[PDB]
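Would you mind writing out a protein's amino acid sequence and the numbers that encode its backbone to help me picture the idea?
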Amino acid sequence: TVTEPVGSYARAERPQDFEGFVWRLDNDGKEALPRNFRTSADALRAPEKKFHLDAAYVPSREGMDALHISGSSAFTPAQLKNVAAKLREKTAGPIYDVDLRQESHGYLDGIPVSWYGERDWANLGKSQHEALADERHRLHAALHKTVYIAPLGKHKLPEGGEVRRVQKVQTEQEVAEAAGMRYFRIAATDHVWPTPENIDRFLAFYRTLPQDAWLHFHCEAGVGRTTAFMVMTDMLKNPSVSLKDILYRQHEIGGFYYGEFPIKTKDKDSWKTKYYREKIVMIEQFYRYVQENRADGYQTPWSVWLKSHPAKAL
């Protein structure tokens, strides 16, 4: 019938095809803050043209001051400290570093890096555990080793960079704890909608949070996956507001825009189209999930609910 239901198109891809091959530089550290740093309490800004949105429209801000959420890109330990210091001014509640990265990542001599593979799919198809297992080993194996760490440029291949003998090896968790942030990991594969597993995990985590918890989501670039969860929490926590208000709202503060829009990639990025389209349909299904489990505390697992309310492709 359906080998892969809408929302799992990525399962049809072959892991053995995007294995890691270089340590990517996640952030060079020139900035005091990570890229795309945004807060739920920020003021809404002008939309991006590409998204063909109505700049004259004014989204509700209902529940945003209480949403208590932030997003951003990968960071250097110093930057996490700046982020945390900055969030502390807005809460006496514990600040979580919600790592949404499935790809193996950590710090080498304080330098943020990750094991990069084609399409950042070096851990594609792995269970969360296997994913983190790879992370620990890859990281630990670098200690006292001569590594090549590089940024990506043309064609997403290494370009320039540096080579050194790692003396200190750190884990996101270690850096975050040290920054005074609680750590929570959700290994979501890059460019695609999160698996029902990723979302179940988040739901379970969401339900347990202290009323005054501040969530700082972040992926590699801080746009795709990170906006995904900022949008989910927004709905989850403020189910009164409209799909439109939240999508618009989450975008106008610095996030990606999760509504239909003239998708226009380049010949070399054509593979991404179906994934942008799959995401657009799945944010819409998550909204529906919420409205339907609003009454309870979202006690019904999303994965189970998805199987009996499959999404139609659009």
User: Anything to note?
Assistant: The two ends are 19 Å apart (CA to CA).
